[PDB]
Structures are given as C-alpha cells and as structure tokens.
Amino acid sequence: KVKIPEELKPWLVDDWDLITRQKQLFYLPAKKNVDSILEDYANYKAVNEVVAGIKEYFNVMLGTQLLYKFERPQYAEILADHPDAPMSQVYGAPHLLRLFVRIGAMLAYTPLDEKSLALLLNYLHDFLKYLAKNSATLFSASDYEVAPPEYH
Amino acid sequence: EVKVKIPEELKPWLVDDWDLITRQKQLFYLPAKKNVDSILEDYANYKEYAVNEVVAGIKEYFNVMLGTQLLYKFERPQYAEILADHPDAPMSQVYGAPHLLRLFVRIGAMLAYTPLDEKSLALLLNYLHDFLKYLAKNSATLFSASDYEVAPPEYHRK
C-alpha cells in the first residue's frame, strides 16, 4: 500500500477542515500548481515516467475523485470557462496530496508484476517523503480563502 | 496510447450509443437495472489471481474515468444530478454496460502510463480483450437502445 507520512496526516485533517467545516476554497488558479511541484521534484532528482504518471492520473481523477462536495461548484466554474484546460495546471499541493490517499487502489494492474509494484511504490513513497519534507512551503491555510456568500 | 482492440461486433453499437445520446437526445435510464458491478461479477463467475486483479482494476478505472472521460456533453447534467443525490455511491454502482464499454476505447491512454513490464502488459491486454470478448458474447443482453429514453423537456435547458 501507499503509506502516508505521519507528518502529513494533520494537514490532511486541516485540508478537510478548511473546505468542509470552514466553507473555504483553495485559491484557484493555483500559485504553485501540480505541474510546478512535479517539475521541482524532477529537477531535484525514470523520474520522467514517474512525474508523467502522477500528472495523468491527477488530471483524470481530479473532478472525479479528489474533490469534496463543497468544491464541486468551484470546479464547475474553472471548467465553465475552459473545459479542456489541464487540472494539473489549475490546482495545487493539497489536491496533489489527496491523490495519494485515493491512489492506493487506482494503481490497479500493477499487483500483477510484483517486481514493478515495488519499484513504483518506492518512487511514490519517496515523492511523498519529498512533500513531507517541504510541508512548510507546500501546505498552508494561506492558500485558502473563505467562500463568497454567493458561492453558497 | 496502448492499443485496446474493440471487437468488430461491438463497433456498430458504439455508433448507436453515440447517436442515441448526441443526436436523438436520449439518456441511458440511470439507476441501471444491470450495473457495472453486476456485470463484472458475472464475468468473474464465468472466468484466478489475474481474473480478480483484472476485474478490480476495471472497476477502479471505471470509477475514476466516468464523469471526466466517458460522458458525452449532453449527459453531463444527468451525471451532476446523480452525483448530488448519491455522493457515496461509486459510479460502477450507478452506470451500466454502454458506459462500461466506452471505458475500453479510452483506457489505453491511461495504460500508456504504467510500470508493468512487457510481459505483464501483454498479460493485462490479453485479459482486457478477454473481458471484451465476454461483452460481445452477451451483446444482445448488455447493449440495447431499449435502455435509453428521450430526456425530459426540463433536461435540454441545462
């Protein structure tokens, strides 16, 4: 399985709290989108294959599996404008994190080639360890804003 | 994109499905009498470790791809409504065969990104084609225009 770093669990709750309880939304478009984040993990240092896979799944799974019910309308709006715009360019770090908790199953045929699964698993965990190390800069309530009384 | 060959038998239905929706403006009756979960189970009962991995995988991709990849524009409001009503139900529990089939014309792009080596990839594709053979074999039952109805007056204006 994909173990989430302990250091990142509290953020997972704060993320859920900001959206779900405080009725706030992550600032869209993102100032530090998924693309940017993946590009930095890459340069830091195949990785290319890893970064592409993460992006593709994110682009498919956001909108379908990574949004809380309170964020749907906000999502409908970004699409309302550009229905073909990439999601990995609009959203940021918190949503990228959500992917890893909703990917443990979305990594589906891999269990077949146990040797590859291990490898891939190794890279996902390392990337996760990367996010964990940089939590300070990546996950912050500063990137969230209260939703307009209209949004409701 | 990884090449997933669609059984010739099923190609005409693919056009009919597209027509029913985008031309005739009909909708697949949604609480599906025979859902993706049901179908996947029938296949499994029909036929292993690989079989169980393939079925579970198909379901995961369906639930992850429906909504953003498998719907024609005219079906989006129906989907949004389904989502508002049942936020806890996986799409494989709501949708049926026609949509399950659409998954196979789009799944190849996703496979393009996978750590499965050559042999393992080959094995996956052989099983995906085996599943398709199963749908084709049961086409008269699984794919029917009779499961579609003209969308209500209220629907078009959405």
Swiss-Prot record, chain A:
Q: Tell me where it resides.
A: Nucleus
- GO terms, molecular function: chromatin binding
Give the quaternary structure. Component of the NuA4 histone acetyltransferase complex which contains the catalytic subunit KAT5/TIP60 and the subunits EP400, TRRAP/PAF400, BRD8/SMAP, EPC1, DMAP1/DNMAP1, RUVBL1/TIP49, RUVBL2, ING3, actin, ACTL6A/BAF53A, MORF4L1/MRG15, MORF4L2/MRGX, MRGBP, YEATS4/GAS41, VPS72/YL1 and MEAF6. The NuA4 complex interacts with MYC and the adenovirus E1A protein. MORF4L1 may also participate in the formation of NuA4 related complexes which lack the KAT5/TIP60 catalytic subunit, but which include the SWI/SNF related protein SRCAP.
Source species of the chain? Homo sapiens (Human)
What does the UniProt record report as the effect of altering residue 13 to E in this chain?
Answer: Abolishes binding to MRFAP1
**Its domain of life?**
Eukaryota
Q: Which residues form the MRG domain?
A: 1-152
Query: Which stretches does the entry tag as region Interaction with RB1-2?
Result: 117-138
Quote the protein name from its UniProt record.
Mortality factor 4-like protein 1
Q: What does this protein do?
A: Component of the NuA4 histone acetyltransferase (HAT) complex which is involved in transcriptional activation of select genes principally by acetylation of nucleosomal histones H4 and H2A. This modification may both alter nucleosome - DNA interactions and promote interaction of the modified histones with other proteins which positively regulate transcription.
GO biological process per UniProt: chromatin organization; double-strand break repair via homologous recombination; fibroblast proliferation; positive regulation of DNA-templated transcription; positive regulation of double-strand break repair via homologous recombination; regulation of apoptotic process; regulation of cell cycle; regulation of double-strand break repair
- Gene (UniProt): MORF4L1
The answer on whether this UniProt entry bears the keyword DNA damage reads yes
What phylogenetic lineage does the species belong to? Eukaryota, Metazoa, Chordata, Craniata, Vertebrata
Whole-protein coverage range: 196 to 358 of 362
